[PDB]
RNA sequence: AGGAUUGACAUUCUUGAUUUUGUGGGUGGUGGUGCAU
């Protein structure tokens, strides 16, 4: 969950936050998506014809080994207010996190390098 | 002259002004259908296709990381805050001389909190109360059942049996009609409708009955609407 | 080369009185070279509503980039050569209210306009203006916590005080980076800029309205610095009510 | 974001938590008048 974390500060950093479906396909579309955290049986096959088929296409794209809560995540991450830090809010917010531009800091990062080194 | 000056003076400047005005709206709309759809022949010649930022970041994000409260919207001093309590005291005794010279649907507050005997209606019903009030989003027309069903269950307690604890069923009723003032201070247009219907069901009950309908806890029912 | 209406653009919103914009202007956040011919509009002609329409639209098209594009070169050198014409030092309303919807989006608000108005030229009396227009409309709760801990990093200045100042009597709820940052304010001023700067009734005004209630999440220690603080820098108003809130002080 | 709010090409699209509604409550500083300007 540490990577998580770490990857959450990353994305805290860059702060271009597109978290959306016409967003993500727009993303998908153009070369710019490469961490799109994604959860896959909800919603009766709704997106993962073609994300999966662009996935499979010859390009990595995948730092997923298993997909994280799509009740915690978004409010485990930045969103909002100071928004109940304390009083632990799980309220679905986006719950699809992209973590954008090369998704690498520094050399204490080498464990997305092992995550998305497999597929 | 004064008065034709100073009307010839403001009749002309405003000419002038609506000659700005005018001149002004014929020139935006051309302007406007002149580059709006006609720059799209300028859209088809050229195209052009954080060190404090991230520590602003890095402190927002402790700031949603964790946070904590301050206490009351105010501080105030002894004297202060005798003066106030000491307009409240006179606004109430003015007014009160003019005055004086012109989760509960009737049974389910039962259910609820039919377990114990005494002591565990108070704490549940305290309890439903601050937890209906915190997350009350817009929980009014449930505030207002409980008050009146907390008034039913008074009524309905208070002449079913006292030959068991009569010093914790004084008490317990003590701290009921203790903090259904407390909280009845500020909630009457519930709690009155219910007043008035017992006293509309209790008048034909006296009607069918001669002495064999009136409850004990008619008397309690008159004393705590007079407390209130 | 762009197809130079624009002259005629600033022609008529150099004289504008009321009524509608223009649509390659309206459109120009979806036309990518829209601050290149801003240039070429080279907009030192100006209007009040003009410039309320023109931040509406800015703050609709506000990220960090255009905020570097636009607000941090010409925008609010604007808004100072404006408030340098104002005699009075009184400034318009119509830019005022250009102001608080430009405070609407936070987003890049802080390099876009907070950083520069310390830089240069920056006196007491816009410092308070501008924390004034703050104090009216809406500010947002966590990265204005960010911006009392970078702002209270940043060097001392009479202006970033009054911005402080100002931005408690906001009455916010105190969370632990602002209480952190408020007693290592205090290991701030100590003796240090004592014998360096002298802080008057101003900011015995400072730490007054802030401790009247702003004391929730102090430990004992930080009771005794505070009162430390009331023993070194006595003014009149340190008894009744620092020993007031020393006693309703909590954990 | 499995959709709040911001730019509308009039009904259909280029934003992204500033939200949102309740539950509360502070008043609203673009002020003058005596001081060493």
């Given at each position: ?12 950093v ?9 967003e ?58 100071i ?11 986006a ?17 997305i390098?092992?995550?998305?080194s497999?597929? | ?15 002038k ?17 002149d ?25 927002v ?43 509960t649907?009737?049974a ?30 817009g ?29 914790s ?22 709690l ?37 | ?89 009184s400034?318009?309303?119509h830019?005022?209210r ?19 108005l310390?830089?240069?030229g ?68 100590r ?14 005004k ?20 505070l ?25």
């Amino acid at each position: 969950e540490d990577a998580l974390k770490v990857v959450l500060r990353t994305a805290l950093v860059h702060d271009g936050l597109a978290r959306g479906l016409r967003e993500s396909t727009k993303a998908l579309t153009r070369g710019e998506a490469l961490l799109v955290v994604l959860v896959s049986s909800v919603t009766e096959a709704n997106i993962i014809k073609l994300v999966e088929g662009l996935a499979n296409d010859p390009e990595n794209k995948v730092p997923l080994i298993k997909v994280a809560d799509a009740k915690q995540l978004g409010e485990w991450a930045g969103l909002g207010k100071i928004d109940r830090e304390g009083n632990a809010r799980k309220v679905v917010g986006a719950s699809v996190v992209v973590v954008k531009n090369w998704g690498a800091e520094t050399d204490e990062l080498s464990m997305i390098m092992e995550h998305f080194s497999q597929q | 002259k004064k008065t034709k000056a100073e009307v010839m003076k403001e009749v002309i400047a405003k000419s002038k002004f609506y000659k700005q005005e005018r001149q002004k709206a014929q020139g935006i709309m051309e302007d406007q259908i002149d580059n709006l759809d006609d720059n799209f022949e300028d859209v088809m010649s050229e195209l052009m296709m954080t060190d404090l930022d991230k520590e602003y970041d890095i402190k927002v994000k402790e700031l949603q990381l964790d946070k904590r409260a301050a206490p009351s919207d105010r501080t105030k001093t002894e004297e202060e805050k005798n003066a106030e309590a000491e307009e409240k005291k006179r606004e109430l005794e003015q007014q009160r001389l003019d005055r004086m010279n012109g989760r509960t649907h009737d049974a389910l507050l039962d259910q609820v909190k039919k377990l114990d005997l005494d002591d565990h209606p108070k704490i549940v019903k305290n309890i439903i109360k601050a937890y209906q009030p915190k997350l009350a989003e817009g929980n009014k027309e449930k505030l207002g059942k409980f008050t009146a069903v907390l008034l039913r269950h008074i009524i309905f307690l208070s002449n079913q049996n006292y030959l068991k604890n009569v010093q914790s069923f004084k008490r317990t009723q003590n701290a009921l009609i203790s903090i259904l003032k407390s909280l009845s201070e500020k909630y009457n247009r519930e709690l009155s409708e219910e007043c008035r219907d017992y006293i509309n069901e209790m008048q034909a009950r006296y009607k069918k009955n001669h002495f064999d309908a009136l409850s004990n806890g008619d008397l309690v029912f008159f004393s705590i609407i007079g407390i209130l | 080369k762009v197809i130079k209406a624009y002259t005629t653009v600033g022609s008529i919103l150099k004289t504008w009185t009321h009524g509608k914009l223009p649509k390659l202007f309206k459109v120009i956040p979806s036309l990518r070279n829209w601050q290149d011919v801003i240039y070429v509009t080279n907009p030192e002609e100006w209007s009040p509503h003009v410039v309320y329409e023109a931040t509406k639209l800015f703050v609709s098209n506000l990220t960090a980039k255009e905020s570097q594009k636009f607000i941090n070169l010409i925008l609010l050198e604007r808004f100072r050569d404006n408030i340098e014409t104002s005699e009075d030092h009184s400034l318009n309303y119509h830019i005022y209210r250009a102001v608080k919807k430009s405070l609407y989006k936070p987003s890049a608000f802080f390099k876009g306009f907070l950083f520069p108005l310390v830089e240069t030229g920056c006196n007491v009396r816009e410092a308070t203006i501008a924390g004034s227009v703050l104090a009216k409309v809406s500010v947002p709760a966590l990265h204005s916590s960010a911006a009392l801990s970078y702002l209270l990093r940043l060097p001392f200045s009479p202006p970033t005080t009054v911005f402080i100042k100002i931005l408690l009597d906001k009455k916010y709820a105190l969370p632990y980076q602002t209480v952190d940052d408020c007693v290592y304010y205090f290991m701030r001023f100590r003796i240090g800029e004592d014998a360096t700067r002298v802080l008057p009734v101003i900011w015995h005004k400072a730490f007054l309205t802030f401790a009247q209630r702003y004391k929730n999440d102090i430990t004992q220690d930080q009771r005794d610095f505070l009162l430390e603080t009331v023993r070194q820098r006595g003014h009149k108003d340190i008894g009744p009510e620092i020993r007031r809130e020393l006693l309703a002080g909590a954990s």
